[PDB]
Symmetry: none
Amino acid sequence: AFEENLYCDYAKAVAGKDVILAVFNAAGDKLLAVAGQQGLTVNRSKDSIEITSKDTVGGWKSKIGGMKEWSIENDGLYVADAESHKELAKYFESDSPVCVKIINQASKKGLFGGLAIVADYSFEAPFDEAMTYSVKLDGMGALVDLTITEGGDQMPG
Amino acid sequence: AFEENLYCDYAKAVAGKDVILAVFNAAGDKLLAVAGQQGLTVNRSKDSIEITSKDTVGGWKSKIGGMKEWSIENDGLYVADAESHKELAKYFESDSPVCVKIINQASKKGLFGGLAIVADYSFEAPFDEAMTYSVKLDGMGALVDLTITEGGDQMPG
Amino acid sequence: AFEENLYCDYAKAVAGKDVILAVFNAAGDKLLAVAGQQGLTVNRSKDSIEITSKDTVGGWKSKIGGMKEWSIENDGLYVADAESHKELAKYFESDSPVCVKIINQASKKGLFGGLAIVADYSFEAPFDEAMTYSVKLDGMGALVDLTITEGGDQMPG
Amino acid sequence: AFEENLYCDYAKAVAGKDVILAVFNAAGDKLLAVAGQQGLTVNRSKDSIEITSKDTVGGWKSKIGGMKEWSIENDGLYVADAESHKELAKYFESDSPVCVKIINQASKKGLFGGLAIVADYSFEAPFDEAMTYSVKLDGMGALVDLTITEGGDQMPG
Amino acid sequence: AFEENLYCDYAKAVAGKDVILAVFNAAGDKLLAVAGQQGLTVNRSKDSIEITSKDTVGGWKSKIGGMKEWSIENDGLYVADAESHKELAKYFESDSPVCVKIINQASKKGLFGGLAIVADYSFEAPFDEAMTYSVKLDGMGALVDLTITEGGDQMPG
């Protein structure tokens, strides 16, 4: 086939559109892709503790790792009666943590999951564009790396 | 040859694509080029201590060098099941230092190597682009300059 | 017949005049060939995402396909009281999408169909020629390829 | 013969009509000349990286070659039920790369082959001419030069 | 491994989070890490007795060491129904000494242990922060240095 793959050979990159943020509803029985989403940022950082002393030799500072924190930023087209946005609205109103999940919907693998505060939930309505939302999810604890953890492959539905 | 090199003479610049970040796996037996990498920054800085006093003559401040620190910033296309990204994920999860190496893969010389904290490991997924990663490696001690040190020329493999 | 087809043998090309643009009226019960049409352009394009990295080997850029878009350009002799032009006028005035169809009226097969914005609807009246119209139909979503889809063979009438 | 070739001697130019674009079907078992094709353009370009510095002597800019990219443009008479055009339609619809080949059908040598995105697939139907198609094939990787590579001489069939 | 440890060599500092205060329950059968603790101070001081006389030669005061005293200060997030805080509350109420222990929970070594008065047990509740506690443990006698004493490595549990 294809002339024995002489000039065409049939994992190299993931399209961003296949990676979506999904939230669980308040009961946990439905996993909801956030409607109209367009941009996704997963932030994970670790603190560095400087432990340089006069015992330190060589002229370089001495550092050790500290504690980790994470946040998720998601923006997109805002539709107020969408079920995921009503869930996010209730989470923001009731001061309740939301279980969030990052999934590759094309490969059907979960990437990250954890409990987040809805730290920011804002909207923009320019007269010449579409109304957009912006949500910030502040991690409350561990962000589980599902790429190196067994399971976590439930798709939104 | 070539008309005695009258108008063509056959070290002047290194293409950035030949300089890659590689990490060792947790055991140290495999050196792994970070998959999908596109940008590389090696930061090395030194503090300055001002020692100006009333003995200082001439109207210029007096300074001496302080301690050194380094970090490495690397971004590129994120593929979650790539072996190097699974290693980086385990390093970030387990709070374990990673041995990193900067190599010129074309000339097969190592440039820099050292122990780093995975200080930041973040991801972006725009709907119209490819999913990218961004990693920050905070140096824990010396960054060995392999350009002026013997050896350090193991290539990723 | 014909001397056993020794020198004459009785699919090779389609005359452009048999391929016409037709629009549905606002209710959808009548399919209307746009009156006086003379030129037809169906544009379909796909974006390319460059995914070249330092893993890319061989010296060639790496690309993947992106999202698709389409438009239809149609020009011809303008007659203002023609029913199809009154429909196009109401679509342009009311900001309502128009269901358009490209058909081969000679072979009675539909070629393409989809929902379009009337993005441009303009007119020229030179003193020495006939008054012409020009319409641009910007696709809102999928342009269904009826050449490889079952059905879609309703003729204007 | 011919008076010892005194005034007539029996590689100097290739007629464009002998150079055709062919695509493989989705399975790869049939190589299909694109039906009705009339024009063919094979674009291959390389980037130039300027590396001029203050070390540069002589007053000329210093440049090195960058990465390569290619595309193929093909136009011709459009017949919608032709097998090659149905294949191109399915490639455009399914977002799947197409294995393309440039061959000299008279000398039966392949010229170029590679994986392409169907980046553009458009049609024109003037009332006084024949309906034409225009296709743009955006290269995804290497375009193999079969003029300097062994093999690649399968003809469409 | 790691290129023979050319640039990375795999005791230099203890993270404060691994050093915790633990108290025994009233019976002595359970050792309880104080819940929510964030800061720890172990104070050990010795008195100096000046013995300068007119026999003292050289112009320097003459001093000898006196008696030792110790205290422990611990603050953190206050949760009233935590078992360790209920134990501390009963110790403060009943005027009974509490057996306290400083342990490195990461290395599982005890550092210090002794009998203390609960000298201060106070709370702060700012409207914009979390409720905190502050406890002061006044030593009643010897503070045993478990870093130079055999044993004393029972972990809280």
